[PDB]
């Protein structure tokens, strides 16, 4: 989520993702902890058996066969963490997330109900306004002439600068806002 | 559930009774003198007691007595055991009468089959 994706997944990344998915589905099948440990050790034994192979064509064929075997043998109802996309508690608090631009439309009386918070909010707003020009200058200086080849962003190269395009990342609503 | 279903379906439905068409023989066929069933409770009594039409069988008087017993001893909802047992026994007797009717129908049907087979054999010979 926080990391910019690459153009493709390498063979190592593909096999590692397959390994993790197979272990998760095996844990779904093997409910008990000792049984899961036994069969996870067996699965890692298989992976270590095929770990050393110089023929990339044969390695790719083995990966394809392993993927087909996993798809046949997957759990129809695998365990999903509650906050994971398939989970039962996914996106439950998205209705409680309110942004700071919505915060600044308050009535003067509502603002006066929280005197100390809004002084620091004004300080943050001034800090944001005093850095945008330097951020855009840095962004346009370091980009290739053709255009951005990836979604990764540069850090602050100077002592007094902030990383470009930081406002919404920094001020995103909390995971349990209300 | 029962053996009669097996006999009727995986067997001779002609000899087994038909529940929807029963009875198929005259009530006096085999009974020289047969007494008609006696009804204790009257139509007006059942109507006043507001018995459901499914409950207005020949065991209705015991049901009326049970209802009267339950109404009088209201807070004590455990003081109608004798009336409940009497009603249950009357229902049991009615059920065994129905069972006797079914068995009589079955054996009359098989006797008719035996007689017709004997007549067919005699006609052949």
């Amino acid at each position: 989520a926080f990391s910019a994706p690459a153009a493709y997944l390498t063979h190592q990344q593909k096999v590692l993702r397959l390994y993790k998915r197979a272990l998760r589905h095996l844990e779904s099948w093997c409910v008990h902890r000792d049984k899961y440990r036994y069969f996870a050790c067996l699965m890692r034994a298989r992976f270590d058996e095929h770990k050393n192979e110089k023929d990339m064509v044969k390695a790719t064929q083995l990966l394809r066969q392993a993927e087909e075997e996993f798809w046949y043998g997957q759990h129809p109802q695998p365990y999903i963490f509650p906050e994971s996309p398939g989970g039962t508690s996914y996106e439950r608090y998205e209705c409680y997330k309110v942004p700071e631009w919505c915060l600044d439309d308050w009535h003067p009386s509502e603002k006066a109900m929280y005197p100390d918070y809004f002084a620091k909010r004004e300080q943050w707003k001034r800090l944001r306004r005093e850095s945008w020009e330097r951020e855009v200058k840095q962004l346009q200086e370091e980009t290739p002439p053709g255009g951005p080849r990836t979604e990764a962003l540069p850090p602050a190269r100077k002592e007094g600068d902030l990383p470009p395009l930081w406002w919404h990342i920094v001020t995103r609503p909390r995971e349990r806002p209300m | 559930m029962g053996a009669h279903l097996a006999r009727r379906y995986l067997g001779d439905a002609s000899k087994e009774p038909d529940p929807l068409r029963m009875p198929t023989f005259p009530p006096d066929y085999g009974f020289p003198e047969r007494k008609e069933r006696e009804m204790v409770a009257t139509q007006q009594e059942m109507n006043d007691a507001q018995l459901m039409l499914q409950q207005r069988d020949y065991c209705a008087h015991y049901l009326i007595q049970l209802l009267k017993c339950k109404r009088d001893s209201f807070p004590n909802f455990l003081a109608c055991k004798h009336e409940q047992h009497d009603w249950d026994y009357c229902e049991h007797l009615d059920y065994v009468k129905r069972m006797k009717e079914f068995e009589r129908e079955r054996r009359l049907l098989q006797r008719k089959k035996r007689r017709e087979q004997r007549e067919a054999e005699m006609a052949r010979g």
Partner: protein, 459 residues
């Protein structure tokens, strides 16, 4: 009726003589007073109508429509004052004048006692609506929408004029009372078939009938908020009122000539609900919902039973109020984000709670939710259609299911979900907008409380 007609003709000079900053206040106050005065027409007789004079009369069918029009004028004033902040004083006064002229023509149309005066007035309602649309519309398609609306209505209604003058020459009078008492059966001949076609087709185009309705999406999408409110709330009810008026002299030919229109109405109700299921524009969704409800009203009028007329009247009133409220809500959303795309703005429930409540209530009334007058009318029409035939229940059930589907789809898409991140100009809802929604919704619930006032003469 002069006690209501003259105050409108006095609304005109008051608006044109008022100050540059008091036009909205004066117009709203006096429109509300006129509506309060017009509330007195609901006291009707059970035998006959209220015959004020030789020219105007009021009936149990005309009274609710007049009250609806008089109550609708101030709401249009509020919405117009919302969207015309930067306009010049003369143009604001011209807009208010157009609205007042439209209200005056509608009142006279509903109270007219002759078919020819009724025709003249209900054709006179075209000019203010066309001017409003083609002058204060926002997008380019307003000109095309105005052309489509105008020419559909006129191509429908000119044969009605010819048939009306022919009927007057044949029978002696176009007075509604006389043509009701002196009615004679309409024999099955080609000439009678074509006269029936002329009258019914004019009012069907006004309804609109399925296959003759594209002008409705074109106009309602491209009209300003006041035009959208008046077009759906009242101007669609002229066809129903006319059909309920003229069917006195079309019997028994209506028994044989109603089949194609009934089939069109039912199948087009299904088709327009399905179209609502897949609309990328909110105003278009509301417009096609209006088309479906008016198709149901057409079915009721065509089957023509005493239970169908009451349902038709109740459904007309309920649909007017509900469609007006829905258009107002969509207009507030549009003024927030300056676009009509449905998926552009989301999370409006967590950004604007009271507007989410208004949306929920409007969508609940849009689908037939008991004991709302929407459900009362729909249920009466369904019962009459069931007595007519026993597959109409299948068609009505399909329509109800799809109606609930698309209403809740609109509600969920607009209000629920997570807010759009880049839309940060959504200011809190105004007291004006909240009052507009409240004044839209409270009369509907009060009419639910007292339902005999909108069930028409057949009650």
């Amino acid at each position: 009726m002069l006690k209501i007609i003259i105050p409108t003709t006095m609304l005109l000079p008051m608006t044109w003589m008022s100050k540059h900053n008091m036009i909205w206040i004066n117009a709203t106050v006096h429109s509300l007073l006129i509506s309060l005065i017009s509330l007195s027409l609901l006291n009707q007789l059970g035998e006959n109508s209220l015959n004020f004079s030789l020219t105007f009369f009021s009936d149990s069918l005309s009274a609710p429509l007049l009250v609806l029009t008089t109550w609708l004028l101030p709401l249009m004033l509020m919405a117009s004052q919302s969207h015309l902040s930067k306009e010049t004083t003369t143009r604001k006064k011209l807009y208010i004048t157009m609205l007042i002229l439209l209200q005056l023509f509608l009142i006279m149309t509903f109270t007219a006692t002759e078919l020819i005066l009724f025709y003249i007035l209900f054709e006179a309602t075209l000019v203010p609506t066309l001017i409003i649309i083609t002058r204060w519309g926002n997008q380019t398609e307003r000109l095309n929408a105005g052309l489509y609306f105008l020419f559909y209505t006129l191509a429908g209604s000119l044969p009605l004029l010819v048939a009306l003058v022919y009927i007057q020459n044949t029978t002696g009078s176009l007075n509604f009372l006389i043509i009701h008492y002196w009615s004679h059966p309409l024999s099955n001949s080609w000439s009678n078939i074509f006269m029936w076609l002329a009258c019914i087709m004019a009012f069907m185009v006004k309804m609109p009938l399925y296959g003759l309705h594209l002008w409705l999406p074109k106009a309602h999408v491209e009209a300003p908020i006041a035009g959208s409110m008046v077009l759906a709330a009242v101007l669609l009810k002229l066809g129903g009122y006319g059909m309920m008026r003229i069917t006195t002299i079309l019997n028994p030919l209506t028994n044989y000539m109603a089949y194609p229109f009934l089939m069109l109405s039912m199948w087009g109700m299904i088709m327009t609900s399905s179209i609502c299921l897949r609309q990328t524009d909110l105003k278009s969704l509301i417009a096609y919902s209006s088309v479906s409800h008016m198709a149901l009203v057409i079915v009721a009028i065509m089957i023509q039973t005493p239970w169908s007329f009451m349902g038709a009247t109740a459904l007309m009133i309920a649909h007017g109020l509900t469609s007006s409220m829905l258009f107002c809500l969509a207009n507030t959303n549009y003024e927030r984000v300056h676009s009509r795309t449905m998926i552009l703005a989301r999370g409006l429930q967590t950004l604007l709670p009271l507007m989410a409540t208004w949306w929920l209530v409007a969508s609940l009334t849009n689908l037939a939710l008991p004991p709302s007058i929407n459900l009362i009318g729909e249920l009466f029409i369904i019962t009459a259609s069931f007595s007519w035939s026993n597959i109409t229940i299948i068609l009505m059930g399909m329509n109800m299911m799809i109606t609930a589907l698309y209403s809740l789809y609109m509600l969920i898409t607009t209000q629920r979900g997570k807010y759009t991140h880049h839309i940060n100009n959504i200011k809190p809802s105004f007291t004006r907008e909240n009052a507009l929604m409240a004044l839209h919704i409270l009369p509907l619930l009060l009419l639910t409380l007292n339902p005999k006032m909108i069930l028409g003469p057949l009650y």
